[PDB]
Design a protein around this ligand. Structure first.
Ligand SMILES: Nc1ncnc2c1ncn2[C@@H]1O[C@H](COP(=O)(O)OP(=O)(O)O)[C@@H](O)[C@H]1O
Ligand SMILES: [Mg+2]
Length: 380
């Protein structure tokens, strides 16, 4: 039985396995190679993953996400208190630790962040067991490079609750570097600087690593923990909500379900705009029985996000400054995260790096799990 690599992500999680010399990223039971890091509770059910994310429109107060923003933190931490103001679910304090509060089968229940993340890990373990047959024993789990020991330990605790032997907790950018074999490339010293540009659903991370004799050293990190694909979706939502109001004289703003359904449609369209120059929006009965069918272009999407896309270069500059490197001293640039599929992002980054080709042959939203799966097989 092989060990698995799990990317336990802020917005999505991904599981891979290394068998017969190669990594397979494992599809879940809806056929998807990534699974939303979502857990929903009702009077009769606990849903995890696609099932949870797909019903958030109908169940916003008891659908938990963003547990990674709480894990290993204290309730009174400024980051926790700030994030709470933007979540539809309730967070409370128990012994100084944050817990999410939900209604579940006739009772108010509270869960530690590591309990929620354990539910997600159990789903990833179950996906892997459906794929492999039998029971999974061991896993490498990834975390952001900036995670402190409390955050790492709480992630380990989620693994323990799930019943996994956590072989190692490794950093996300290191996992990405491992996926590209950057620790097995070259023999002479020098010119071993890699920049990992990781733009996901909720966070943006730039990391510079130097890799000598198979030893990864994190030289610098930069980014924005509140910049990701969800923010690009929201720019579309504002734009298209204005359009619906203009065309149909109805303001969907006060209706949570309508806004959520438009947001889902926008995320779908956004993904399409990474490979096509136009995308359709088709929402039956968006508001008061009125359908919203429309079209959006890649160009318009880029305009709606022009500042956010261009702004990703600032953390790159900062990471370079902190590492005491010039952009010309980066030997490899690696794209990680689903949002790095956006053509304009790729173009801005490649232009910043003076035309240098980017590493993107591994699906960017799978690269962390891929490297975790490689490392798990190595650790046996
Ligand atoms: N083809 C695509 N084009 C643009 N954005 C995408 C595409 N595929 C996925 N995304 C976005 O990637 C984000 C999720 O990033 P991912 O790296 O998979 O998860 P996480 O950030 O949780 O690690 C979401 O905002 C999603 O909409
Ligand atoms: Mg990620």
């Amino acid at each position: 039985m092989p060990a698995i690599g799990i990317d336990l992500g802020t917005t999505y999680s991904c599981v891979g396995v290394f068998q017969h010399g190669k990594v397979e990223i494992i599809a879940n039971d809806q056929g998807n190679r990534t699974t939303p890091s979502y857990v929903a509770f009702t009077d009769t059910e606990r849903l995890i993953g696609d099932a949870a994310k797909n019903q958030v429109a109908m169940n916003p107060t008891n659908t938990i996400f963003d547990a990674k923003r709480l894990i290993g933190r204290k309730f009174e931490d400024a980051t926790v208190q700030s994030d709470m103001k933007h979540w539809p679910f309730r967070v409370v304090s128990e012994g100084g630790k944050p817990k999410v509060q939900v209604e579940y089968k006739g009772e108010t229940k509270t869960f530690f962040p590591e309990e929620i993340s354990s539910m997600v890990l159990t789903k990833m373990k179950e996906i892997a067991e459906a794929y492999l047959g039998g029971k999974v024993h061991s896993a490498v789990i990834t975390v952001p490079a900036y995670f402190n020991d409390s955050q790492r330990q709480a992630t380990k605790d989620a693994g323990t609750i799930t019943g996994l032997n956590v072989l190692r907790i490794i950093n996300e950018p290191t996992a990405a570097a491992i996926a590209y074999g950057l620790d097995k490339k070259g023999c002479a010293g020098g010119e071993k600087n890699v920049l990992i540009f990781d733009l996901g659903g909720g966070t943006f991370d730039v990391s510079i690593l130097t890799i000598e004799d198979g030893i990864f050293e994190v030289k610098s990190t930069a980014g924005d923990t509140h910049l990701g694909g969800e923010d690009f979706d929201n720019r579309m939502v504002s734009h298209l909500a204005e359009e619906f109001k203009r065309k149909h004289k109805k303001d969907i703003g006060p209706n949570k379900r309508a806004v959520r359904r438009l947001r889902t449609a926008c995320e779908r369209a956004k993904r399409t705009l990474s490979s096509s120059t136009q995308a359709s929006i088709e929402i039956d009965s968006l508001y008061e029985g009125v359908d919203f069918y429309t079209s959006i272009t890649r160009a318009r999407f880029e305009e709606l996000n022009a500042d956010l896309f261009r702004g990703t270069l600032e953390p790159v500059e900062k990471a370079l400054r902190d590492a005491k490197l010039d952009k010309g001293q980066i030997q490899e640039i690696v794209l990680v995260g689903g949002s790095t599929r956006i053509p304009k992002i790729q173009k801005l980054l490649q232009d910043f790096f003076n035309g240098k080709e980017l590493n993107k042959s591994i699906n960017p939203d799978e690269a962390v799990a891929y490297g975790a799966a490689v490392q798990a097989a190595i650790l046996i």
